[PDB]
């Protein structure tokens, strides 16, 4: 489980100089990207039906 300092975005909007809005944008999207990502990428992968493979092999 992760800690994730909570964040109000309209404030974040209101603290970036204009000559730095670029950065801030990319920073936002990465976050969103990253977030979407974790929503879909499961903690662990599926297990592996070892019995089954053991059941159908040939090398010992």
């Amino acid at each position: 489980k992760l800690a994730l300092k909570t964040i109000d975005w309209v404030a974040f909007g209101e603290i970036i100089p204009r000559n730095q809005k670029a950065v801030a944008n990319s920073l936002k999207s990465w976050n969103e990207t990253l977030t979407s990502r974790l929503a879909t990428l499961p903690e662990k992968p599926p297990a592996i039906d070892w019995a089954y493979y053991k059941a159908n092999v040939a090398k010992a």
Binding site: L2, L4, I7, F12, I15, L27, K28, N31, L34, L38
Partner: protein, 65 residues
């Protein structure tokens, strides 16, 4: 007779600039305070976004591995 009118209109004019200044200055005590309040909380978020980003990126990485 005029003695009064010029002086009076003078005297009003004054307190008219006085009330004016007074509004304008207290509006500025006000702005300053907003400026502050902002720099307070406000600014950390930038770095928080950044730290959060890292945390996630390592998690994704761990998971991907």
């Amino acid at each position: 007779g005029e003695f009064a009118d010029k002086l009076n209109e003078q005297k009003i004019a004054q307190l008219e600039e006085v009330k004016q200044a007074s509004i304008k200055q207290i509006q500025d005590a006000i702005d300053m305070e907003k400026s502050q309040q902002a720099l307070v909380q406000k600014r950390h978020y930038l770095f928080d976004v950044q730290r959060n980003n890292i945390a996630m990126a390592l998690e994704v990485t761990y998971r991907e591995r």
